Structure formats: C-alpha cells, structure tokens
Amino acid sequence: AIKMMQAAQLHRASIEIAFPMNVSLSPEIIVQCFIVWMSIPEQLLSDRSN
Amino acid sequence: AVELEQLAAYGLTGAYPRTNHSVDTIVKTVNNISATYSTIAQMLSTIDLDPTRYGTSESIDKFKIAWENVESVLNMEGNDFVKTIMYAYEDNFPKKDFYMM
Amino acid sequence: TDYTRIAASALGPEISTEGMPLFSLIESLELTEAETSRLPVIQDSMVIQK
Amino acid sequence: AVEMYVAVRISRFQLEVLRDLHDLVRSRTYLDVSKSPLATTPIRVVEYVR
Amino acid sequence: NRFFHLHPIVTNQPSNTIKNAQLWNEMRLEQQVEHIKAGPVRIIGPFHVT
Amino acid sequence: PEENVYILLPIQAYTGGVIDRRDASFSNFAYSIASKLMMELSAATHNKIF
C-alpha cells in the first residue's frame, strides 16, 4: 500500500516487478499476471513490467 | 520494488490506504517539522565549520556533534524528523556529496 | 590500505609516521644538538599526495 | 689471536651511505578508501523484496 | 603601581608571535630558549585564568 | 588605596567556555560561553517578571 501510494505521486518512481527465479510459465504465474493486468492501473507500473 | 505474488495478493483482495487522522493534523505536523528545520538552520548559521580544516570524515563527525549540541541547547527534546532521515540513509551517499548536502 | 596517520586539524595538513618513529633516531644514532633540530622539519614535511 | 694461521676473508660488500637526513624518506602507495572503498556483498539479482 | 604593590601587568612589544599554544608545547627545549632569548614572545590562544 | 579613589574588582561571573586547540577559532569559544549564558538568563526568567 505504501509503495503504491508513493508510485502515484512522484511521476518517476513507477513500480518495478520482480518475477520468480528460474521458473517459467508456472500455473500460478499466469493467474497472477492476469490479476495484475485487470486489477492494477497501468500508469503505476514501469514500461518493462507492463 | 515488489514481488509478483505480493502485488497479485494486493490487487485480488481490494486493498486501499486508510487514514485515521484529519487534514488539520497532517498540516500541523508538516508545519512543526518545517519550523524545527528552519530554527535548527538559523542556529547553526552562527558557528563556523570551514571545509579546509579537517578530513572528509572528521568534518562530518564535528557537524554531528554541533547539531546535537545545538538541538540540546535551544529546543526541548523531540524527534527531529529531518535529523533521523539524514542519519539513517548516510551509507547510501558518498562522503563528499553527503558533506556537501 | 591501512597506514598510521597523525591528524589534519588546524595544523599543517595530514602528516604520516609510517617507518620507525622519528624520536628513536635521537638515541639510535647519538645525534648532536645541531642535527636534532632538523628532525621536526622532516616530520612536518611528510605530506600525502593523491 | 682467536683466529688460526689461515684467514678466511670476504672480497666484496655493499652498504648504503647517506649524507643528509632529508634523503632518508621513501614512498609507498595505498588505496585511499575515502573515495574508492573496498567492496562487500557482490552484485546479486532481485527476487525477494522484504 | 598606584593601586597594587605587585601585579603581573607588563608592557612589552611582542616579537615572534606564536599562533597556537600547542606549537609552544610541542617545540623542543633549545628552540624554545632561542625564541625566548631574542625578545618577548606572545602566546595567543584562550586560557582559563583565576 | 587613597582617600578619594575606589576600585572595583572583576570577580568571575557566568563563566564557562571550551578550549579546542586543534580547531583555533576565537569564535567557537565565544559561542560556547554565550550559549551557556543564554541558558542561564532564560532559566532565571522563566515565567517571571521581576
């Protein structure tokens, strides 16, 4: 909550997402990505994370 | 920086920041810390610490001692938000630019 | 990286005492009065260059 | 007298003589950690923010 | 002399003023006597006096 | 001393100052004395009116 509140103010402190290590396309990753896609505003994320 | 699972958990269960204070209280706190910073600077302006007398670290130590002395001389004991902020993150800056700041 | 400095405080710049202490030579060499007067000059001329 | 009829001797010798005390100083190099400190905790990837 | 029988008040024009009381302490005895012999010497630097 | 002269002597009052040779500054000494003097004056007149 604190990080998201900060990222909505500074115009340059957009959130950077750290993905799980050495596991690709695990079943939980897909659903978590979907939740992020349709629940987290796009302007609060970095271009790389998007 | 956040983890993917933490962000997904935050998004799934609708979560929002919550405050138990009023606007006047926040304004008063900000004004108090600003006034403390201004008074500290005004008091610190009188004494002298030139940069060509000690090393890059002895000068920092002398400045810390002077700040503590001034704080204990004029104002009653408090928290000194700016002082603690400076103290905590002093290892994230090189010594020269920290002294300049 | 570690050497035995003295100080740099309202006196001359940072001087160094790394070899033998300069005060041991007064007895190791049996110096006379006309020469021991130069030892403080030697001690004060040991600046550090970057 | 404490030696015998035949004498064992040495042909060459090397010793350093000095004329002034000012010549007795030398120089060595160091790192000056004030501006280039020694490193710790080598570079790592980010997977566990907390 | 109109007020005190003995007083430490003196009038000498200083020569060879020493800028710091630490210089006097670290100086060698012979250099100190040489400084004294040439005339009155003034030591600058605050002192606690009663 | 005489029939028509009267002498006032200065007896130390509100003293206190710190000597710091490695940092000569006829100013820090004065500031150190003045700060303690200000403490004394403020404490002597805390919610008092004489």
Side-chain angles (χ1 to χ4, degrees), chain B residues 1-3 6 56 95, chain D residues 34 46-50:
Chain B
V2 314
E3 276 160 30
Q6 289 184 351
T56 191
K95 261 172 191 335
Chain D
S34 67
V46 174
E47 43 174 339
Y48 295 128
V49 57
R50 50 204 52 254

mmCIF file of all heavy atoms in Angstrom, chain B residues 1-3 6 56 95, chain D residues 34 46-50:
data_model
loop_
_atom_site.group_PDB
_atom_site.id
_atom_site.type_symbol
_atom_site.label_atom_id
_atom_site.label_comp_id
_atom_site.label_asym_id
_atom_site.label_seq_id
_atom_site.Cartn_x
_atom_site.Cartn_y
_atom_site.Cartn_z
ATOM 1 N N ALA B 1 10.238 -1.590 -5.413
ATOM 2 C CA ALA B 1 10.277 -2.941 -5.954
ATOM 3 C C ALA B 1 9.345 -3.836 -5.153
ATOM 4 O O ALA B 1 9.392 -3.839 -3.919
ATOM 5 C CB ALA B 1 11.698 -3.502 -5.928
ATOM 6 N N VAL B 2 8.499 -4.590 -5.853
ATOM 7 C CA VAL B 2 7.567 -5.511 -5.216
ATOM 8 C C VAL B 2 7.667 -6.868 -5.897
ATOM 9 O O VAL B 2 8.098 -6.981 -7.046
ATOM 10 C CB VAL B 2 6.111 -4.999 -5.263
ATOM 11 C CG1 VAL B 2 6.041 -3.540 -4.870
ATOM 12 C CG2 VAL B 2 5.530 -5.195 -6.643
ATOM 13 N N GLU B 3 7.267 -7.904 -5.167
ATOM 14 C CA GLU B 3 7.173 -9.241 -5.725
ATOM 15 C C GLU B 3 5.878 -9.388 -6.514
ATOM 16 O O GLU B 3 4.888 -8.698 -6.263
ATOM 17 C CB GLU B 3 7.220 -10.291 -4.620
ATOM 18 C CG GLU B 3 8.611 -10.679 -4.179
ATOM 19 C CD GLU B 3 8.612 -11.323 -2.808
ATOM 20 O OE1 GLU B 3 7.608 -11.978 -2.456
ATOM 21 O OE2 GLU B 3 9.606 -11.163 -2.072
ATOM 22 N N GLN B 6 3.071 -10.718 -4.138
ATOM 23 C CA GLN B 6 2.573 -9.686 -3.233
ATOM 24 C C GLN B 6 1.656 -8.714 -3.959
ATOM 25 O O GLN B 6 0.595 -8.345 -3.446
ATOM 26 C CB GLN B 6 3.740 -8.941 -2.593
ATOM 27 C CG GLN B 6 4.499 -9.754 -1.572
ATOM 28 C CD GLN B 6 5.587 -8.951 -0.895
ATOM 29 O OE1 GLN B 6 5.893 -7.834 -1.304
ATOM 30 N NE2 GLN B 6 6.175 -9.519 0.149
ATOM 31 N N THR B 56 37.519 14.551 5.334
ATOM 32 C CA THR B 56 36.145 14.412 4.879
ATOM 33 C C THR B 56 35.255 13.711 5.896
ATOM 34 O O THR B 56 34.029 13.785 5.775
ATOM 35 C CB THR B 56 36.100 13.656 3.554
ATOM 36 O OG1 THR B 56 34.787 13.754 2.993
ATOM 37 C CG2 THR B 56 36.451 12.193 3.766
ATOM 38 N N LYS B 95 30.897 10.124 0.749
ATOM 39 C CA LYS B 95 31.148 11.045 1.855
ATOM 40 C C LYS B 95 31.192 12.493 1.388
ATOM 41 O O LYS B 95 30.688 13.387 2.076
ATOM 42 C CB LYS B 95 32.444 10.664 2.559
ATOM 43 C CG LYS B 95 32.224 9.864 3.822
ATOM 44 C CD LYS B 95 33.530 9.344 4.381
ATOM 45 C CE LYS B 95 33.278 8.328 5.476
ATOM 46 N NZ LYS B 95 31.945 8.528 6.107
ATOM 47 N N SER D 34 38.771 6.520 1.258
ATOM 48 C CA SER D 34 37.861 7.651 1.388
ATOM 49 C C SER D 34 37.049 7.857 0.117
ATOM 50 O O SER D 34 35.883 8.264 0.173
ATOM 51 C CB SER D 34 38.644 8.914 1.732
ATOM 52 O OG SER D 34 39.468 9.306 0.647
ATOM 53 N N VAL D 46 17.503 -9.546 -8.006
ATOM 54 C CA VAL D 46 16.435 -9.217 -7.017
ATOM 55 C C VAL D 46 15.301 -10.233 -7.163
ATOM 56 O O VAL D 46 14.686 -10.265 -8.249
ATOM 57 C CB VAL D 46 15.900 -7.791 -7.248
ATOM 58 C CG1 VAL D 46 14.706 -7.473 -6.358
ATOM 59 C CG2 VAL D 46 16.985 -6.741 -7.096
ATOM 60 N N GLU D 47 15.040 -11.038 -6.128
ATOM 61 C CA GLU D 47 13.867 -11.939 -6.202
ATOM 62 C C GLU D 47 13.057 -11.907 -4.911
ATOM 63 O O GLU D 47 11.927 -12.399 -4.931
ATOM 64 C CB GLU D 47 14.322 -13.370 -6.473
ATOM 65 C CG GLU D 47 15.522 -13.787 -5.655
ATOM 66 C CD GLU D 47 15.887 -15.252 -5.807
ATOM 67 O OE1 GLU D 47 15.013 -16.031 -6.224
ATOM 68 O OE2 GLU D 47 17.040 -15.609 -5.496
ATOM 69 N N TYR D 48 13.610 -11.368 -3.831
ATOM 70 C CA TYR D 48 12.876 -11.442 -2.550
ATOM 71 C C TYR D 48 12.863 -10.087 -1.855
ATOM 72 O O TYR D 48 13.599 -9.939 -0.876
ATOM 73 C CB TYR D 48 13.525 -12.466 -1.626
ATOM 74 C CG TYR D 48 13.468 -13.898 -2.091
ATOM 75 C CD1 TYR D 48 14.613 -14.671 -2.155
ATOM 76 C CD2 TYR D 48 12.267 -14.490 -2.436
ATOM 77 C CE1 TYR D 48 14.572 -15.990 -2.570
ATOM 78 C CE2 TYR D 48 12.207 -15.807 -2.858
ATOM 79 C CZ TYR D 48 13.364 -16.561 -2.924
ATOM 80 O OH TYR D 48 13.313 -17.861 -3.335
ATOM 81 N N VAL D 49 12.057 -9.138 -2.333
ATOM 82 C CA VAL D 49 11.932 -7.838 -1.616
ATOM 83 C C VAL D 49 11.238 -8.088 -0.282
ATOM 84 O O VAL D 49 10.312 -8.912 -0.260
ATOM 85 C CB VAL D 49 11.169 -6.792 -2.442
ATOM 86 C CG1 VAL D 49 9.783 -7.267 -2.835
ATOM 87 C CG2 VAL D 49 11.099 -5.455 -1.722
ATOM 88 N N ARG D 50 11.679 -7.414 0.777
ATOM 89 C CA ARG D 50 11.065 -7.551 2.123
ATOM 90 C C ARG D 50 11.857 -6.679 3.091
ATOM 91 O O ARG D 50 12.605 -5.827 2.582
ATOM 92 C CB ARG D 50 11.067 -8.994 2.629
ATOM 93 C CG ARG D 50 12.410 -9.704 2.554
ATOM 94 C CD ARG D 50 12.187 -11.203 2.502
ATOM 95 N NE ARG D 50 11.254 -11.599 1.455
ATOM 96 C CZ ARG D 50 10.005 -12.000 1.666
ATOM 97 N NH1 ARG D 50 9.533 -12.071 2.897
ATOM 98 N NH2 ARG D 50 9.238 -12.333 0.645
#
